[PDB]
Structure formats: structure tokens, C-alpha cells
Design a protein around this nucleic acid. Structure first.
Ligand SMILES: [Mg+2]
Lengths: 239, 86
RNA sequence: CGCGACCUCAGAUCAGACGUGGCGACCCGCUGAAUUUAAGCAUAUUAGUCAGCGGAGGAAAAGAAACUAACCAGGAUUCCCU
RNA sequence: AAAUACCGGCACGAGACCGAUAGUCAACAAGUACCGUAAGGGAAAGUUGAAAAGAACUUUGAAGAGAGAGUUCAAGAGGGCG
RNA sequence: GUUAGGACCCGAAAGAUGGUGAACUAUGCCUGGGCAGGGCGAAGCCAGAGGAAACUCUGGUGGAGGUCCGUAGCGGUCCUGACGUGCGAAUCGGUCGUCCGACCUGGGUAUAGGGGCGAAAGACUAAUCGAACCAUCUAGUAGCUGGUUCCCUCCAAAGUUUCC
RNA sequence: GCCGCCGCAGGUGCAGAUCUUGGUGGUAGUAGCAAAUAUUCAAACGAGAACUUUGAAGGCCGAAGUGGAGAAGGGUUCCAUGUGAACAGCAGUUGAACAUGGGUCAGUCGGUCCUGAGAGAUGGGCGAGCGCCGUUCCGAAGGGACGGGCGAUGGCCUCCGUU
RNA sequence: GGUAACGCGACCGAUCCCGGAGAAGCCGGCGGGAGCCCCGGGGAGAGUUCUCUUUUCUUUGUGAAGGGCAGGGCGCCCUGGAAUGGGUUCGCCCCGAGAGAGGGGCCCGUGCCUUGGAAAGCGUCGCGGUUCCGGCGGCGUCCGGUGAGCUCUCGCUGGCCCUUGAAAAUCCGGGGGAGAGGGUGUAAAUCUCGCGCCGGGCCGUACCCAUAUCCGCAGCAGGUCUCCAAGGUGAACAGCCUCUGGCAUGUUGGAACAAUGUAGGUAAGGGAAGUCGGCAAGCCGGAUCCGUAACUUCGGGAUAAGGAUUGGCUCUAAGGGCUGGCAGCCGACUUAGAACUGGUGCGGACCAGGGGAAUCCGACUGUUUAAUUAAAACAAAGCAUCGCGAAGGCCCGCGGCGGGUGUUGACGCGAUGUGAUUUCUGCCCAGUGCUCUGAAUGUCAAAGUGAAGAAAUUCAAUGAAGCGCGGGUAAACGGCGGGAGUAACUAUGACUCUCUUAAGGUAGCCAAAUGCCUCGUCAUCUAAUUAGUGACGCGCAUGAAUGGAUGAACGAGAUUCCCACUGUCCCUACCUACUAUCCAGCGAAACCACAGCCAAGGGAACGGGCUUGGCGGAAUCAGCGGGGAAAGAAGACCCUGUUGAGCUUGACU
RNA sequence: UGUGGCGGCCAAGCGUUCAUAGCGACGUCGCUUUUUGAUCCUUCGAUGUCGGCUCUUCCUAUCAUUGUGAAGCAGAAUUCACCAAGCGUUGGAUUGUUCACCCACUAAUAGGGAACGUGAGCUGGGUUUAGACCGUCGUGAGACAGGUUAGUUUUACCCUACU
RNA sequence: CGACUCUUAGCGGUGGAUCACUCGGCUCGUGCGUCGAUGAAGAACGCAGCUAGCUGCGAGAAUUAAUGUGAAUUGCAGGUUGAUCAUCGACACUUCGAACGCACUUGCGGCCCCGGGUUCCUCCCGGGGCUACGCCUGUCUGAGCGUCGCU
């Protein structure tokens, strides 16, 4: 597959939740907005919420989409800035907060308005800070510690909607509508049952593999199917 | 079931008559003329299509300007003169 | 702030001139595959091959030397014969 | 500019070429009628009488269809009629 | 008498070049429609009885499912029935699986050929799919089959030596 | 309109090729005019009525109809008069058969206005090339307008469309 | 105007900002209002009237546009503060953040009648025009309560989603006060109130919507997108008979009733004993009442298995609204009981379950090769790991910071292996692939450096990636032996030894969709069983996520046995219809060297034709299939050609 | 006629005794195609090929029955042999089965051919198109006299022969 | 006898075989060898007294004004001082279409000038001229703490 079939179907999902534009009011000041209402957005598992601000130069009722945190209510004043206090639901730079702070919607670089760790029940943990040359080590939920230049800003708290994948799938009738809403790649067919003229692992009379599933990283398209550069396999023993 | 029961569902025509060339070659979905070419300025022609050259020739149509071009060329291109009266 | 120009770049129902495309037997510049031959076949041959794109003319191409040449020398280009 | 190429078109002439299943597929209201959703494919088809003088008049029969007359050198040429 | 050119004639199993098709089938998106009559009582809840407590039973309410018999509707297991030069280049009878949910689908649009689609059968792609239709190269190749037209007279054969 | 004779030239000699086109036979008056219950009498225009007309009787489809109306699609197939060349597998006076004519009337009915899936001009860039990517993407992107001043016009420039 | 919801008749006001309709999923239940039906009486038309019958059927009102009155919803503001807890639904929920008791008030009103409106229309009877005439005159165009009857609309409330159920044009609603208006009246501006005047361009409007107008070469049993839907029987939009509407049997008519065909039934007696094959065919069938095992994921089994009943006529008892402990008036259906009685008759025609116990596979609903296989195939609920932090994971591309994933961030994007519940997933890096690491490094292109030569040429160190080197990788492929002695009668084996690689098949299952020998040995069902179930593995060649054990309910899955019944059979026989046959009209196709009386001989080793022997004596009709090596298709089997295609690899480039 | 089967010759000898009732060691002479082999004459412009169901005639290498010989035939009974094919030679469990086994009975339950008798006469159970399962081998597309399971059967009306 | 199977002489039907006729095809050469926004090629639609197709033409529509010459056409209606035809140098030359205001549902815009309406006071109707792309030398208009002149 290349496209136009396996893509995710996005019709009722309108827009994306972006972080507020940086200025002097986020550099060396703070400003207050209100929480209008929260709603479960289609497509995304985590719900969104309307946060109404105002422009300091203009007079249009602005609004901003943020990820809804766990344990928050509507009709609440949210402060944002460098000089803001420490509470749940507050975006602030990393150089002001101390170490060991559970944050989400983190930026890998200052300017992209929030990319890292903002899915359903995910948060990156700041390990330690560095005052000289503005460095910060942040452990990602995978386990790797990334170095961030401490110019970005991030909200406080975990994302609402945690523990969604703990319960197994009840029935294929629910699964068909869920994957029909998400993306049309649910009838997963085995490559042995597939034809050998298109899929490489097909062919033969009996149902057998007969070839090593490990594959080199340097491989062209069509061949690159399977465990991609598998160091080990089987049951994970220990860590 | 691939035959007579399949001919019954076929009711919505796709090809229709074009306005430039005037042939049954206008697809409604692609909005492109199959014979000559409706969006493009040029007319679709090929050398392997030997019978398509002799279908639509210049001798088939009017040649209402071409025949008076030859009729003025056989005189020698006089420009708005008058014959001698009585 | 105010006053006059040189350069870069701007929009037309500004006056007036152009190109668009049908067709094209001949021609100019480019891309230019295999059926086949090699009793098989890959080097070679078919083969600057069909086909495709752009362009004007009654012709186009074309033209006066950083030439043939070791002869006792000739001296723009073109077609035919050996 | 000069001698070089022309299978399409504008005006003709000529032929040890063919003669209505032949010759251009098409000698006639031929790429026309017709078929395919489409790029496309693609037919059958001449010979009245020199001259229509194309049959008036009687009868059978609802009319169709016959039997006698007339024309002309001959109907031995009777409306799809060398 | 022989060779090369179409070279006594016709004939495939295939290759390349260029256009055209998702009106049948297959996957989506948008906007809409439809789907009788009955069984089972899953949850919320009331009163009574027993018990020191914890709590346990009895009698009603009530409507839940990838629910069932089953209509409309979707396809046709078996009888290899009728027909089998058919009404029909794939129809009909007995006969079923399913029928509030992985249900069928009316219109517009996206996906086209060493490519697309595909709950995966080289399955389907306009009566054609182990690589769609039409035209050109193409009169492609054929140590191979099929045929190849007047008379009279004279002469008069071999199924082998060697090689690839 | 044609034949012989002297030289020359050929698209010059047929029995086949599951040869090509066209024509005609045995077959053969054979097989056949059987998916879904049902018709029977009186008169009639007409030469002519198992099939057409009216009058009577007996039934079927049983509201999920053998009913009335729509969309796609068909394009005069709707009606009147006359006709008897061909069709309705016999049949026909009849019929969607042939020829002459009529027949569709909107301020209030739908399209027309807009967007959805999607397509697409164009800044820009690429491409020898017909052309390609993209729908904001590197752009000199509002040709619109409330009010104030100044010269001028139409109606005593008064007030408005004015410029 | 009022404390107020809000109303009346116009009752200003820019830029800009905000909000609403637009504009929103499905299902269950309840209530109200209409339409179509049901009934009693009264009217206008007809049929029955040998007999009775206050009998049978057709029919009985009102649009758009303005207003009032019913009737609903009220999450709308006040007087007041409730637990000994109250109002209240079919169900529930609410309540000192304000229940019940009381007053007002807006929203929809399609139900009532008023203007429209009886003038029109529907009938009955008569008067003309012989006719042309929205002709003419009298009468009716009713009186009422109901109903889980069918349909439509509105309102209330709850449940379902790991799925949240669309955008655009349009309008007014709200703050907002820079401006336009004026000096006491005939004021100015302002008018969304009632009016008055003129127009609203263009395109199409006929017919069918189907066994004769759409497509299928056609009057083609096929496909075929939607609306409207009477009475009884009955739970039913199921089946049957009748109302409105339509119809004259679908490419033909008459005659008799042969065989053999097609569709149905009836069949004395046995009842799968015929046949691979209860295949086909047949029996049971609904409702009420009693009652129900093994195993179990306790939900299913289950309608388990099983039994009794199924008429007519005529009675009794039980359950409600209105008015003034209490009496009267209106009453719509269900259930229970009893006697008489019908030729044991009753779900009298239609509808209309086959079960019980075993084996194997797959959980199952679902997709499926248009047109031979619907299944053990696929989708599959669960589990296991691989890569990746936007300077990248994957795919596409000829190209432009190319596009998709991405409107996306490890609970994410792709890729696999297996795949309901419950236990395990062992050992082994021998080999092939995957990953990590480096100058301690055999090997090592191009280019650069240095040296010799008059120069093209020659030599030397350096020599990138990768190979080799060291480790892990068996939810990667895969693999997991053979020979001898031996324990107190013997048979047989514990145990011990040797060869050898990576340890040499761990535990389970099993002559299996898996054992050649083999119909392997034992109990079983039967007169008999190459059949099935239960056993031991010793297994040509079983084996533990290429999977194994187990598995409640189910599969248009594959087999075994018993009840149930049947012309499957014993063993054939009979009836109807459609057929076939003859007559009127019309009227093919296939095949064709030529024709079809035989036996023996030979042949290209099986002839109708040649030879020798038998024979053959007009012409047609209904059957039959023995032959015409009956028609079909240059065999769908095999081989060859120096003939072509697809898959696949470490063949070659 | 390599294989199966049958009939004669000499008669080591068994048969208590005794070659020839019943037979037979050693060789040995002929036969056939309901079988397995070899051969390659015609058929690759095709003769629809496995078994099971119904169907008829023909042959004798005779199982019984009719009529006679021959014993180690007291009687029944056993067979050895002739004339001799006129008339007879079942049912069921399993296997797809040809073949083979068992039970009950009778008179025998003897053996065969007809282009491997036999589809415009039936049946597809297994082979014998592709779909899947398990086991082995091949690194790999695939192969397994090793299995499992479901898998489209057209037409006589022409001539002869029969009635 | 009749009827049926075969052969021969004469005649009738289907067929158009042989021969003949050809305003028709095939080849070669000669001189010339040109379209168009001043709207080309192509397609659709209308135009005749009775007019289906071809041909001819474009609302001036089977064709005009004019020249040489001189009494037509036919199945029928009608008239030398120019009917028939040949010539054409002048004009007309519809809609789509390189098609040029946008789409291509023929629906929607914008500017200017005239006639009803009026008595410019504006709505409605009719007619005409206009309205695409990139580019060139003359005019137009404003951008640039790049330059610097002057206050
Ligand atoms: Mg038996």
C-alpha cells in the first residue's frame, strides 16, 4: 500500500490543539484566560477543552485548544506565563520549575507549539536541570533522556483518559466500528495465506515459514517485511 | 448472474456528446474529452490512427474561406477594385 | 516631518503592434523499444528504426576556411557517375 | 539566391493498368447506413424501351389477382422492365 | 541452379509503442431511506419474613443482548429435480443461513493495467483476467502441418560414407 | 462487334486446400405453436367474427394486487380521421402497423443562490518538450467604504444618484 | 401596566464585538391530538319478500388567510418553610441550593365555530330548449357517546458509544453613544402599526414506470430506485374467503384418452433389512396444564427427555366512570366453574419442532472463487516481541523544503507470528540470517604523497565501507541417535558400559484430516462386521506459540447406534392435470463422398463395399436405443521442437 | 506363451500286505487367453476410460439333476470316469471396492466370454482440474503406490435392425 | 394403366453465369505551390410554393448589387428597356468553437450612450459599443533608515 486506502478518515475532527503563540507576555509576564467547556473530540481518544483569552492589542474574543488534564473542571481561571504560580493546569518555562515535575505537551524545540507527550495518559519527567547554557534532561515515556534547551513551555499535570487499554476488547462488533472510525486496515491477513506473487512470505503447499524472519536494515522495498533488525526475540526475561 | 442480471443495473451513461469536436466522447466524471481534448488547447491526433485521419478531413467540411482563398490566388490578389461599368 | 533625482521592482478596458490553434506530402533540432538475424543467446545486427514534442517556408537544411594535401599542387556551398 | 525533395491541395494532359464480388472500402443521397459505454470497426448496391408511345376500352372479383384489346421493328423489351 | 529482400500462399504459444474504460464486480467519503407479529427477564427499585450484628430468602415493577421462531429484504446446502438446439450466452420447484446489528443499499466523488482493488479465492476488473480493449511494428518467427491448375514424346532415382 | 496470319508481352489453362463470396437440395411438411385455473350465449358495422364491440351469467388477482401514480431510462410512443404493402410465429375490421393533422400555458411548481466528499485556474518552483507539484505553497493580495475640505455641472447648485 | 414571567400600535440610532436558528446518532416505554374504521336512532336510492325478516348495502361537510375558546408542555416569578419525611411515574427522578397548599403568566394549538361558506358541490323528483344553457324549481347536506382497533404528528423520560453522530449562504437578537432635531407648536427628525400604487427575467411541464414503452440481438418466467394499503377469521404488514380497481390464460383451437415423460396425491402387511450414503420422500407439529437428567465457564441445557385436553346450545361468578361508610344513572373486554348434547367428534381446509447418546475439527454472528466445493478457509476475542523522539520508522515518486502516515507523539505510527475460558511453551548457537564493539587487525577501490626515468610508464607506506575476528540472538529458520550384559522356573524389563555431536524427543496426545507392515492385540455392540467407541506405544515419517492438552452452547462441517414413520425395498398396482397422437393455419435445426439384407477369409494384424457361401418381392405411421468406430474440439493424458509465459534461487549478465 | 491352469509317458515308491482303487519322486511331450510380462502394426482433426444396478444368447475344462460303467461301494455316504449345456446354481454385516472373509439355507450355491460386454441405459463412492489439513523430503517454486474432505455428465426427429 | 425410383428431347420459376456498354477507379509528368483574433479549421441548427437525403447559403439565409451574351425552368401555379446560366473585384456571412467577462447548470456580473417611463427622479423594458492571457518603445501613478544634494 502507498495511499488513498489505508489513510485515517478525518471528517468530523476539525482542527488541532496547538500551544499559545510566544511573545513578551509569555517571556516576562503572565495573563489570565477562562475555561469555557470541555468536549470529547472525535478521532482523538483524549478530550479537548476551549480556553478563551483576549489579545492585548486587539479586541476579538480569542480561543485556544488544549489537551484536557485529569481532574479539571470548566468555568475556571487559568493563568499562563513565567511569573505564574504553581498549580494544576499552568503552562510555564522549564527553567523556572524545579526538578521532578510531571509535565505534558512538551516541545522538543522552542517554536513548534507542543509535540512531545500529549496522548491519552502520557507524561515526560524532568530528571535534572542545568543552569549554565540552559540545558535540561527530560526522560521520555520510552525511557530515553533527551536534552532540551529550556526555552520551551509546558503545562502541569497528566492527560485525562488514563487506563483506556487496560481492559481487553469485548467483541468484534465494537472492534469493527472502532477501527472503521480510526483507519481501514483492520482485516489483517497472514502473509502465508497471501499470494506469493505480491507478498514474499507466501507460497508453498503446506503452511510453513521455512526462512529466517530476521532481516538486515539495509533492504529495499518489498523485501522489508518482518522483525526489522531484531536483536532478541521471545519472552522478555527481567528488564 | 454476470450476464442478463448484470445488464439491468446499467442505466447511468458516462460518455456523452462533446461540443468542440461533436462526438460521443465526453466523460462526465473525468471532465475530459476522449476524442480531441476539451481542457487542452490542442487536438489529440496520432500517426498510428490511420483511419482517424481520414474520418475528419479538411475536405469534409465547408472550406468556405479556403475556396475563396484559392479563387483569389488564381486571380492574383487584387484588393477591393471595381469592374468596368457600361 | 517637510522640498527636488539616480538604480531595483510595480497595474492596465493607457495609443498602437505580436504568439495562442486546425492541417502539414517535403524539411530542421531531440528522445528513439522489441519482435527478429546471429537455425539457441547476452556482445554485435535490425537500429539515430516506428512512434512522440516543438517549428516556418515553396523550399528547408546550406554556404566563403584554425580546408584536401606531401603533389610540378589546388581554394565558398550543392547533386550524379566511377 | 543557383542545380536538391514532394505521396496532401490548387489547373490539366497521357497510359502495352482494371472493368460492377475487378478497379480507391466506396462508378449511385459512402466513412454513408450500421455496431460498440470508448479509444474504434465498417458494409450490400449499374445496364427498360431510340422515343413512356407506362396499357385508354369490356368482364370476373370487396379489392387484390386473371381473360380479351392498344403502342412499337419486335412485350420475343410488362414499372426490380440488356 | 542458388542467396538476400514479403520472396508458392495462410497460420499461432509472445514483445514493444500510444490512447480508452471502477455504468457489472471490489474498497472507501458525503448526503438519505427501510427493516412485521411473539419467547427468554439481564440491571435500577418496593414491601414482608428470619437474624444480636454481618447479612440471607420470599412476592410484584421493569426491559437486555455481536438474542431467538419468523415477514419485508440479502445469497442459494441438498434433491446433482424441470429445462438443458431454455423464457434465460447460468432461469424455475421442494428446500434454507440470517432478519436491531459485523443488515442490505438509492445518487455525487477518489483509486487503471507488471498497475489498482482485494475479511486473501492469481479471486474480480463491461457475456474477456496466471497480466483488460483497439491500432501500429507485422506480411514478427515457424527444421511444422494443409493445398498448389493444358496435352504429347524420350531418359530415368536414394532411404546410404563422414561431420556438427 | 469479331476471327486468322508474322513477331512481342501477361494478373494466361482449377477439383479439392475444415479455400472465399453468392445461390440451391435430401432432411421436411419432421420436431414444434405446454412456466403462472376459466370461460359461455344474443345481436351488431363488415363479403367474411375461437380471438373485436356492447348486454347477461360464472370466476381470478385478495390492499405486500393482475390497482392508481412517480425517478432513471425511452422521445410522440397521447388523441382524432382514413388505409389495408409488411408485423402481432394461424388469425385480425384491432393494435405502440402506415399517412395527414392537434396536443405540454407558472411572480406562488423544481433548476437557478450556497457548500459537503472531490476537482481545479493562479503566486512560486520543476521540466528539452506537449506539460508537472501544490491549493497559500518563497508573493508589491482590500480598485471597497462612514465622515471633513476644495472647482464644476441637471432641477432658482436648495437637496439627493451626482462627478 | 405589574414584585414578576410578559403584553400593547409604530416607540431612533454607526464602526466594532458577542450569541442563536441554520445544524444534526440510534433504540425502548408512556401520554395527548387528528385521519381511516365500529355502533344506536333519523333521511334519499335500490335487492330479497312460496316462508319469515323494525332486513341488506351506497351516503351524510369544509381550504389557504386573521381572531377567540378548548387541550397540552412549563428547568417561569411571587405568599410561605417541609423528618414521625412529603407531592409523584407504565418505569423513575427531584426536595432548607427551597416539597406539597394558593394567585397570575407567556409557547404550540392542525380540535370547536365565526369572515371566507352555501352562492359552489353531492343525490331525489318534475318543467322545458328535439338542441345551444356553471338551466330552472321543492327536500336532505343529521342527531351522540365511545374503543390497549390501524396510520400520522407532537410532548415527556430513560438506555446504548473504547464509534459521539457534517459544512456553507442567510437573518434578526444584545451592550454601544460620534452624529443627525427643536423652542413651545400646524414643533423637527424618527417610523418594523393599519393601509394605497406598480412588477417579479430564463429553462421543463404530453405518455409508461412494466410477464407489450428501462436493460438484456426480441410482446424475454431474469435484474429492476420510491409513495398510498378495506371486512371477517387470527397475537400477526403470516395464510385463506369477500369490497374498490384491473383481467379475459399470456407464440394457437377441436377430438378421443395408447405406451412412455412432467407435477401431484391414495395405497392391505412388514418397516432402511436395497444402496457409499433414512439421499430423496414420510411422521411429529399450535395453545393450555403437570413436569424435567448427564456435564457445566452455573449464564445454557430446555420446547430436554416426557404425558392429559381441544365442538354446539343455555347459565353462574369476578374485575369500572358520573351525580348527590351511603343510593341512582351509564357500562367494554378478559378469565374460572357446571349440566344437557354431537356416529369419540373436535390446533376438523390454511399456518404447522424430529429427538436422545457418542468421535474429530473449528468457538460462534459475519466474508467467500459472478457460473461445479460453503466448508475444518478467512475475518477472529487473547498473547508474544522488532524499529523510531520529526536532523527520523515505513510507503509512493522522473522531478520542485514533493506527498501520505501527520488534524499525528511510546496508552503513537508500520510490521509480523499465532489466535473464545484454564495449565505449559523445555533443552541446543552445530549451520544460515539479525544486532553490538574497535586500530590489538590478514584483507582492502578511487583520489592524494614520495622515489627512478628526456616523457608516456614503474615501485613504496597509507589502504574508506564491507569481509575475518569476540558476545548474545531457538514467540528467527530448525534440530533434539545407535549398540551390548542384566534382577531366585521362565517371559520381559529396572540397572550398568561403550561409540558420538549442539544438548540427542521434555511432558502430553495417538494405527488420529498423522502407522507401509496392519484387516496390529483386547472388551463391546450384531447370526456376521476391512465399521465405531474404550486401551499400550513399540510411531516407515507424532510432538510441545511452525504448537499441545482440555473445551460449556453452536456450526446448510465429517462419521456410529436406538426410537418415530414412510411403497427405499419386498412387489408392484390405480386416479387427475400437463403431456404425447389425429385434423384447420403456420412452420425450423443438426448431419450429409454415396448408400444402409448377413456369415467366414485376408488386410494399415476388427469392413456396408474385395472373393465364396446364404438371400433380396411397392410405400408410409406410434415406440425403442444395438450400430452408423452418431455430431462435437488439429486430444483436456505423454513426448518432441535448438516454441513461448508465470513463480522461485547463491545459475549467467 | 516368460506367468496361471489342464491332459498323457516311464513308474523311485506311499497306499497294513500289493506299482496302476486313490496317487506320486526324477524328468518329460502339447494346449490356451477370464490374469500378470515382452512386442510396437494401426488410433493423438479423440471410439467418453474404474466399479455397482437391469439385460440376453453362446461355449464346457460338470456342481447337482436324467441314463450307465468303476472301488480298499454290509446299507447311507465318499469319489474315478462317460453320454451330456435341456433345465437350475440365494439373502445379509463391512470394504468405493475388482478381489477377499463370515453367518443362515438349499440340489448346486461350478467356472467364463460378448472391442477390459454394457453412459444419446442409470450411479458418482474412490481415482482423474484447481481449494485446505497433518507427516516426511527439498534452503527454494514443489514431490510423496501416504491419507483425509466437497467437487457442472449435452442431443435421436435421419437410416438399418427389433416389435 | 394410375402413383413412386432412374435416363433422354421440348417448356416454365429462383439465380443474374457468358458477352457487350462505362459521366468510374489506378499510375506518371508539367507550372503554380497561399489559413487565422480584420475571428482560421471543425461540429450543431435554420433557409425552397408544394422540399426526406445530397448540394448551395447564413435572418439580406437552394443565395444579393454588377459584367459578357440574350427569351429561360418544368409535374403545375407566374412575366426583350435584360429571364436562364458563366464571371464576381463590393457587401452580408447565424450559435458553439484557437473563442476572448466567469462557469459551461445558459445561469450570473460590471462601464458608457440612446427610445418608452419620464418631464434626471429614479426603479422596470428594448437597442448599440465594451469587458481574457504574457510582452514591447511614448504617457500615467505611487514603494524602497540604498545614495546624496538643500533646511
Ligand atoms: Mg446387501
Amino acid at each position: 500500500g502507498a495511499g488513498s486506502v489505508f489513510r485515517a478518515h478525518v471528517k468530523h475532527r476539525k482542527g488541532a490543539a496547538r500551544l499559545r503563540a510566544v511573545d513578551f507576555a509569555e517571556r516576562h509576564g503572565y495573563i489570565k484566560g477562562i475555561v469555557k467547556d470541555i468536549i470529547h473530540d472525535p478521532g482523538r481518544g483524549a478530550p479537548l477543552a476551549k480556553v478563551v483569552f483576549r489579545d492585548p492589542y486587539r479586541f476579538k474574543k480569542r480561543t485556544e485548544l488544549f489537551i484536557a488534564a485529569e481532574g479539571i473542571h470548566t468555568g475556571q481561571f487559568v493563568y499562563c506565563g513565567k511569573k505564574a504560580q504553581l498549580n494544576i493546569g499552568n503552562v510555564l518555562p522549564v527553567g523556572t520549575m524545579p526538578e521532578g515535575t510531571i509535565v505534558c505537551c512538551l516541545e522538543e524545540k522552542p517554536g513548534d507549539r507542543g509535540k512531545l507527550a500529549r496522548a491519552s495518559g502520557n507524561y515526560a519527567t524532568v530528571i535534572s536541570h542545568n543552569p549554565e547554557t540552559k540545558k535540561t534532561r527530560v526522560k521520555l515515556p520510552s525511557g530515553s533522556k533527551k536534552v532540551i534547551s529550556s526555552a520551551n513551555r509546558a503545562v502541569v499535570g497528566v492527560v485525562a483518559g488514563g487506563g483506556r487499554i487496560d481492559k481487553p476488547i469485548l467483541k468484534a462488533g465494537r472492534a469493527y466500528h472502532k477501527y472503521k472510525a480510526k483507519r481501514n486496515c483492520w482485516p489483517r491477513v497472514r502473509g502465508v495465506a497471501m499470494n506469493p506473487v505480491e507478498h514474499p512470505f507466501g507460497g508453498g503447499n503446506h503452511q510453513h515459514i521455512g526462512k529466517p524472519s530476521t532481516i538486515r536494515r539495509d533492504a529495499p522495498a518489498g523485501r522489508k517485511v518482518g522483525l526489522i533488525a531484531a536483536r532478541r526475540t521471545g519472552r522478555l526475561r527481567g528488564t | 448472474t454476470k450476464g442478463t442480471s448484470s445488464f439491468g443495473k446499467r442505466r447511468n451513461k458516462t460518455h456523452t456528446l462533446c461540443r468542440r469536436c461533436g462526438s460521443k466522447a465526453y466523460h462526465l466524471q473525468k471532465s475530459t474529452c476522449g476524442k480531441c481534448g476539451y481542457p487542452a488547447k490542442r487536438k489529440r491526433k496520432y500517426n498510428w490512427s490511420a483511419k482517424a485521419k481520414r474520418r475528419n478531413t479538411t475536405g469534409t467540411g465547408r472550406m468556405r474561406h479556403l475556396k475563396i482563398v484559392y479563387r483569389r490566388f488564381r486571380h492574383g490578389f487584387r484588393e477591393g477594385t471595381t469592374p468596368k461599368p457600361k
